[PDB]
Amino acid sequence: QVQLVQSGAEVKKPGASVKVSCEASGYTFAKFAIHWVRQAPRQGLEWMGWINGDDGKTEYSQKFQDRVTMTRDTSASTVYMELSSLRSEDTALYYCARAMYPDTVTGNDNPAPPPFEGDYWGQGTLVTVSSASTKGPSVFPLAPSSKSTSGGTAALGCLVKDYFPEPVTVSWNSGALTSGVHTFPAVLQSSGLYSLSSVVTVPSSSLGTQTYICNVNHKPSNTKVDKRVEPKSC
Amino acid sequence: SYELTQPPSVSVSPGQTARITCSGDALPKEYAYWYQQKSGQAPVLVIYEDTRRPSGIPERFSGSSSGTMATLTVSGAHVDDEADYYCYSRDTSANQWVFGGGTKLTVLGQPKAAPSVTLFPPSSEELQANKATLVCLISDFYPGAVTVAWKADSSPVKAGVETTTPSKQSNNKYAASSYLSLTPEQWKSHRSYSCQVTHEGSTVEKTVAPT
């Protein structure tokens, strides 16, 4: 029941600043510090810093000590992380992760080794540093067809066209349909916009009685699109 | 200062043991932590406190630490153990946590696999929106290298093709997609369009036509 939920992805200009939020739930917010680690595309993990939940005391990485500041809201159970002087090399996926050890030492207690309390990360927040403006996606249904059926299985999906920036998450039937779903990585088109597709391999017998709806989520543009995919007249 | 260094790549055959060794001067008095990161996924902690597994990790993952070296060991490696492995420990001098550079674990001897191809024509909704996109989806092929060629009738297409680079799926095979952008007039004026996918001596070609 431990959960760390981060703010949505967003585009920001070079020189501006970002502030990602990390909201905790399922544990005592005061007894745990919260890390912040980022990962640029195709690069390795890099630690940025951490901050305790109670006193708000912070400790920053030597690489980010100039530009990062970390804060927390005692009442809202949320820690924050801000990076100014953004450049293109700061385009990365920013995670928050709860510390492995709770604070057992501050309390009145003769030695007790604090126990490992689990591996818990947030979902991450993609920060794209660019001059291009945000653009919501155009969603089109990829209908199932006879020339698109492999025996008992049929292919159907949704085309998510011309959006910026990344990412787009796709679910099906509001998350109730999970098996046989394949969301493909997006393509960076010559126009500078992204497009991707998500397809479901479904039983070809059900096509006249099962409802298939793709749920597209583009947080940078605060847009959600649902599209009912049905067989065509052909 | 201080640093943790690990090799960039380690190759292992299916069934034998793979060893990822992280080297750091503070490892005698500082614990080592190991993260596994599969393609397009968040890191997963597999070893905490030098040698202990978080509950839920298979016991074929094991860790040790001696002197300036901490080693992650995968005994009898599955293909599913292909991932990036990061060591993680404390830098006491600078008062900061540090990650290793990461090690890519390659499981050798994975067999060749032909691609599955699905080609979608333009939806009527997009055509009524004065646009046309052909969607060619390629999956379950290994190794991760394909050639995508498009055809109008029988002739090669000269423009409007966008094709992703293959990336690993969760089943450790590869997936890719290719998009052909047309005007609604180009779509309806031809008899057919084809997506031709070539993968090391195998070629699957799918074709769609205006109804």
Partner: peptide, 13 residues
């Protein structure tokens, strides 16, 4: 056995 860092300014020996 080894050190256990809790947070900024919190450790175990």
């Amino acid at each position: 056995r080894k050190r256990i860092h809790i947070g900024p300014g919190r450790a175990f020996y």
